Amino acid sequence: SLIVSTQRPSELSPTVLAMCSNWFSLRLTNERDLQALRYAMESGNEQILKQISGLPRGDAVAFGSAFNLPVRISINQARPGPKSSDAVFSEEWANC
Amino acid sequence: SIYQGGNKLNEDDFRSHVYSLCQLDNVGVLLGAGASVGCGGKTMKDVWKSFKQNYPELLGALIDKYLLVSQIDSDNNLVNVELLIDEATKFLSVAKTRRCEDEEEEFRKILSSLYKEVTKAALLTGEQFREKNQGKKDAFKYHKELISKLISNRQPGQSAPAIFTTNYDLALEWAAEDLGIQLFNGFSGLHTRQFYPQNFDLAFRNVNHYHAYLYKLHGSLTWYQNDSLTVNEVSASQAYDEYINDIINKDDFYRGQHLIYPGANKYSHTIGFVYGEMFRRFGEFISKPQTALFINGFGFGDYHINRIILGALLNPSFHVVIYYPELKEAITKVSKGGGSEAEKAIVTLKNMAFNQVTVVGGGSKAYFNSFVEHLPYPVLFPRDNIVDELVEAIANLS
Amino acid sequence: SIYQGGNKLNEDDFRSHVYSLCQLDNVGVLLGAGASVGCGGKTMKDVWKSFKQNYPELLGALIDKYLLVSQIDSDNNLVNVELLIDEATKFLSVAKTRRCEDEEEEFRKILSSLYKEVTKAALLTGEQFREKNQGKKDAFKYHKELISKLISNRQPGQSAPAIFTTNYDLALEWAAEDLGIQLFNGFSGLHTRQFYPQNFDLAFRNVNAGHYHAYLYKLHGSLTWYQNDSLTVNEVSASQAYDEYINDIINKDDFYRGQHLIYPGANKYSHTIGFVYGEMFRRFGEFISKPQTALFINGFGFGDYHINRIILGALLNPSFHVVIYYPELKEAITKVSKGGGSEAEKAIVTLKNMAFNQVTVVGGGSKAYFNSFVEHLPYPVLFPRDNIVDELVEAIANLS
Amino acid sequence: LFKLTEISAIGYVVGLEGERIRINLHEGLQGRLASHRKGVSSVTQPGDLIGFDAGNILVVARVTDMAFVIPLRQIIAYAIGFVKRELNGYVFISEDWRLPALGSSAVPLTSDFLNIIYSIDKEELPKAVELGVDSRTKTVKIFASVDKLLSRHLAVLGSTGYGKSNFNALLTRKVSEKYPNSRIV
Amino acid sequence: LFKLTEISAIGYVVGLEGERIRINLHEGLQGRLASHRKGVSSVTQPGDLIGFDAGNILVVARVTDMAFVIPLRQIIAYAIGFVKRELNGYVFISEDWRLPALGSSAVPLTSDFLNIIYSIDKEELPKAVELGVDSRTKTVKIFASVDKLLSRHLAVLGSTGYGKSNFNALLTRKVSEKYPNSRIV
Numbered sequence A: 001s002l003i004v005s006t007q008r009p010s011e012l013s014p015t016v017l018a019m020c021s022n023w024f025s026l027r028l029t030n031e032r033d034l035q036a037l038r039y040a041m042e043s044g045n046e047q048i049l050k051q052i053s054g055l056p057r058g059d060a061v062a063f064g065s066a067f068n069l070p071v072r073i074s075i076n077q078a079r080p081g082p083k084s085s086d087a088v089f090s091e092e093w094a095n096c
Numbered sequence B: 001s002i003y004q005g006g007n008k009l010n011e012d013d014f015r016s017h018v019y020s021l022c023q024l025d026n027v028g029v030l031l032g033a034g035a036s037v038g039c040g041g042k043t044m045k046d047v048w049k050s051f052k053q054n055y056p057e058l059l060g061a062l063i064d065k066y067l068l069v070s071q072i073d074s075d076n077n078l079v080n081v082e083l084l085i086d087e088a089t090k091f092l093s094v095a096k097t098r099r100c101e102d103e104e105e106e107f108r109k110i111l112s113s114l115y116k117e118v119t120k121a122a123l124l125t126g127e128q129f130r131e132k133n134q135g136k137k138d139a140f141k142y143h144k145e146l147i148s149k150l151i152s153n154r155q156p157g158q159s160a161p162a163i164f165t166t167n168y169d170l171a172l173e174w175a176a177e178d179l180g181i182q183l184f185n186g187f188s189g190l191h192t193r194q195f196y197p198q199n200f201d202l203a204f205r206n207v208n209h210y211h212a213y214l215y216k217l218h219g220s221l222t223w224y225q226n227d228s229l230t231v232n233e234v235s236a237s238q239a240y241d242e243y244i245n246d247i248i249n250k251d252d253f254y255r256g257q258h259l260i261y262p263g264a265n266k267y268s269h270t271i272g273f274v275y276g277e278m279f280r281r282f283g284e285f286i287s288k289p290q291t292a293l294f295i296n297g298f299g300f301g302d303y304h305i306n307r308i309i310l311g312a313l314l315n316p317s318f319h320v321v322i323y324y325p326e327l328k329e330a331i332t333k334v335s336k337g338g339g340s341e342a343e344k345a346i347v348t349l350k351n352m353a354f355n356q357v358t359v360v361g362g363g364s365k366a367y368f369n370s371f372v373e374h375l376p377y378p379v380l381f382p383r384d385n386i387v388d389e390l391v392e393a394i395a396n397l398s
Numbered sequence C: 001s002i003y004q005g006g007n008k009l010n011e012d013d014f015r016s017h018v019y020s021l022c023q024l025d026n027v028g029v030l031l032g033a034g035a036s037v038g039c040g041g042k043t044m045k046d047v048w049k050s051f052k053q054n055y056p057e058l059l060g061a062l063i064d065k066y067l068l069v070s071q072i073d074s075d076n077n078l079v080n081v082e083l084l085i086d087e088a089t090k091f092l093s094v095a096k097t098r099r100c101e102d103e104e105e106e107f108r109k110i111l112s113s114l115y116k117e118v119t120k121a122a123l124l125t126g127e128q129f130r131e132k133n134q135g136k137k138d139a140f141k142y143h144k145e146l147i148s149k150l151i152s153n154r155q156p157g158q159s160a161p162a163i164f165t166t167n168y169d170l171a172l173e174w175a176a177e178d179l180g181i182q183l184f185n186g187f188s189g190l191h192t193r194q195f196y197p198q199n200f201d202l203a204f205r206n207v208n209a210g211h212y213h214a215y216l217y218k219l220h221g222s223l224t225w226y227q228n229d230s231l232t233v234n235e236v237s238a239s240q241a242y243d244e245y246i247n248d249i250i251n252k253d254d255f256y257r258g259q260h261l262i263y264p265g266a267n268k269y270s271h272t273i274g275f276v277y278g279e280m281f282r283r284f285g286e287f288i289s290k291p292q293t294a295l296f297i298n299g300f301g302f303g304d305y306h307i308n309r310i311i312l313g314a315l316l317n318p319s320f321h322v323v324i325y326y327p328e329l330k331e332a333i334t335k336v337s338k339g340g341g342s343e344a345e346k347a348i349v350t351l352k353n354m355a356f357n358q359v360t361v362v363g364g365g366s367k368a369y370f371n372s373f374v375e376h377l378p379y380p381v382l383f384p385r386d387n388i389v390d391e392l393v394e395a396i397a398n399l400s
Numbered sequence D, E: 001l002f003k004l005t006e007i008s009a010i011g012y013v014v015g016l017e018g019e020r021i022r023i024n025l026h027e028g029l030q031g032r033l034a035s036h037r038k039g040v041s042s043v044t045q046p047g048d049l050i051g052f053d054a055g056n057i058l059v060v061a062r063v064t065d066m067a068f069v070i071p072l073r074q075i076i077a078y079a080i081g082f083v084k085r086e087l088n089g090y091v092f093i094s095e096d097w098r099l100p101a102l103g104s105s106a107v108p109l110t111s112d113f114l115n116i117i118y119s120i121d122k123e124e125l126p127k128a129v130e131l132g133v134d135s136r137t138k139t140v141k142i143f144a145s146v147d148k149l150l151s152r153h154l155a156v157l158g159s160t161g162y163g164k165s166n167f168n169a170l171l172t173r174k175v176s177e178k179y180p181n182s183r184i185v
Ligand SMILES: Nc1ncnc2c1ncn2[C@@H]1O[C@H](COP(=O)(O)OP(=O)(O)OC[C@H]2O[C@H](O)[C@H](O)[C@@H]2O)[C@@H](O)[C@H]1O
Pocket: B031, B032, B033, B034, B035, B037, B038, B043, B044, B045, B080, B081, B082, B166, B296, B297, B298, B299, B301, B302, B325, B326, B366, B367, B368, B369
């Protein structure tokens, strides 16, 4: 069991992508990041890559061996949640 | 507090589910006497409570001599009123045709007192029953909202809403004459208005969203039978000038075949033709495929209506929604045994594993004013009223 | 014990094959007296034991004088009853016409005794035969399943199933009058029924834009069919028949009318009764020779010459398929291997051993009964396999 | 009193041109909705799922096109799989080489059939982890198998500010709650 | 006196070929210009916004093509999002897979519905800065959140001989007045 990670799969062998099962991906807006995904998969489905570019917040697309067919998932919040947030610059500049 | 098939629902899912039912092929509403207490009406319990207090001497005669009403229901206030009136009218007719002078004067007083009690509560405004433009008052604020919400949610090419009711007051007519909507109720003509049963098959078209249907199952205050064997309708002012003033401020009861409310004089072959036709039209409506029905303000105290409703669920495309304020007491009383027929009927209806039945409980979350709030507005409906200002300016011009 | 052309098959392959044969152009089912034994009926060899136990005197005077049944078969229970009844009727008619009083008196005592035993085993419910709503009991639970399964597998615009039977009881009509299906059996009317052969070509159709019906052929008659004085054949209700003549036949001991009943194949010498019997055989022959026919057999002992002859000749067609049920294969094979058993055993064995992919034989005792025959048939995915209306109906009945 | 189907039909197939199924629409449908014993379903939005009934199988399809031609409407769909009945329930299979026949009826599939398609082995239900609900309908639950996740390959991606760390924490916590003992780097 | 809508329509939908939409326009000046209580509106060229009524929601689309086929005209558009009631006003969502049904009317977008699309989330209004006005209609103002802008990398682009000095000076003048505490090395 391995985890190959690439948000720019163009500069990689499709055999890395064609010899693997499961993937996870949220909204991703880039036209040249799908060439390996376009080629690696066998003939039978090509129209399901259009909607990966407009998923709203909290939605994700998962497909692989653990799933019979590709499915669109709405992920619930995890409780207790992750870190609150990053730094807020309102207080620093309140000196004015 | 909201059940559908045995389990429990929450507010958001219920609100989303209701919106889906409003878009079916056929939609209808059934209202009772509990939908008018918000504008000046009275429940059937209060009428009996007042009559028992006001006329004590006749109460003993009704219970002991003629055996028309029992004692347990009188002491519990669970007495049906229209059936008693029908029986009294039958007794009076038999006594008159038999030529028994002693009993002829005994029932006149009873009928006059009963008609004085029932009629005085049906004037939702009072002495201003005669005047015009009674739909502009604040008391009828929610009937307009109900009608507008029902009408605005229909796509072109679809049918029109159907409204059934068991009241005999003029709330809906007053509300709908202020919006600019015309209702078909079976009558036609102005100088001589008569009943044509085929008028329920017409509609309007434009040669260059106007209409609905209204069925009354118990008559109306403005319907009466003249000397000729025909049924006529008159406006409110004419009825008040003719026969409503004397009922309230006089001991006047002469004609037993005159009035057509509530469910009285049914033994005449000319008057029963109206009740029978209304009931047939109600029965035929809910037999169509892809139908929905909302029930509010109705206490399940009628055998035939319950029989028809329960037998209409055999079709796989009939959905019903029921509102019932006092639900928990019914469950507690049924659990320990006993209870009236209404409680048993509504508890048995609730416990089935059916997804076509929904029951809503609560004390004030099931009232009429809360039923209206669940139905949705369209996005583009004009809400801000900016016309009355121009009317005020024009009136100020003088 | 599932042989197809002499080679055994496993369960899944047989199930797939039977699922494939249920979607042809034409389908049909042939039953017999063995399919009604689970409701209260009996078989042919069971009646003979009761007859020769209840009336041992007639057996002595029926073999020696008139030579109607052999002594070997009487001691082995291999007699044909409805074929004997025809000979008895012929003898009685000849004696009556020739005016021989003694022979006429003698034969009248035998026909009554035969009809009493034949009828008493066919009421199927006892005294409760003249009552109504007899399909609501649990005895007829599988006939309804068979009827429902046969109809529901037809695609739109396809022919309706046809059912043949050698029985003369009322199980199928009772089962069908409960679901809501209507069967066409060649009769019309309500006050005077009559036989109209031309109505077998009709069908129903919805004028709004239901079409749920089936055909039933009775090859040996029925209890409710009788001929009055006229040259017409009539049908009555169960209660009317019971009040008319069945009660007298069962109870009275010296009752016999004559050329009245049309069961089982009794009075064939007349030219007005045999017209009914001939039509059923002709239509069975016409149906079986269709291009895409698939026929099922169950409950039939293969004891008839004409049916076997017509079945064997119909196989000279490259699109005819047959399925046979016979839960006695082992004994038949053992008895035919040595010198050959009865004619039925010889026929079934010579049918099994041929090398054809069309014929199929199933055995294994209680594994090939009528009850187990139903489950082998398929079942649609969208058919509502539940019971929801009962609660609503009982709730309605509860009120008032 | 005999009803062959408990759910009403919508349309019928008129033409096959490979894997593009052409369906004409009836006239009884007016308000883009249909009601049955369980609820109300819609079929008029492209991108949903439909079904064709042919004997002992149910062919599941996906709508691709919709347009007008007397007003006539047509729908194009692609098949993705079929549903089978084996012992006492149903099972979904993942081959799309089976196609319906001409004249077959078209019927929408309810939530009971939707549960079967997005389902896995019943035995693994105590061994499962909950992830989320269906997006289009929000009426189905989604479960995954931890053992099969670490048998074949898996991968994670995502943009910024969309819930990457949320999913990471949610997935990591449940594994520890279910299997406190494991070897993961 | 009783009216279901105070804004006149322009056409209806006659097809959904995937993500595109087909519209048939009315005859005369009805299909190009309209009038209402607040002013006038028009849909003339590709690049405009059009809206489709769908009962409880309102789909928003962008015009792409216009052409002929007295003649007839039709338009092709793509979807963006929708609008819905929340408590007493409206809200804009950014989901782009919801499409209308066949026969639905088409209406232009008024300034009232244009204000909602270019607004902030009802809670950062007291902490908003005014920058300018939109270009196509020059009727709707634009506001931005202080915390959202000056929290990460900010970039200003341009071309040589085109105003990089000028645009830099103007933008940093109008943006960095009240709170100069940020750093520009
Ligand atoms: N504000 C309210 N809003 C809604 N429901 C209310 C309200 N207040 C009380 N209720 C409920 O409204 C109901 C009052 O029930 P009744 O007025 O006896 O029923 P009917 O007159 O329609 O009886 C129908 C006719 O049929 C037979 O022939 C009968 O004789 C009638 O003539 C109760 O549930 C109250 O809790």
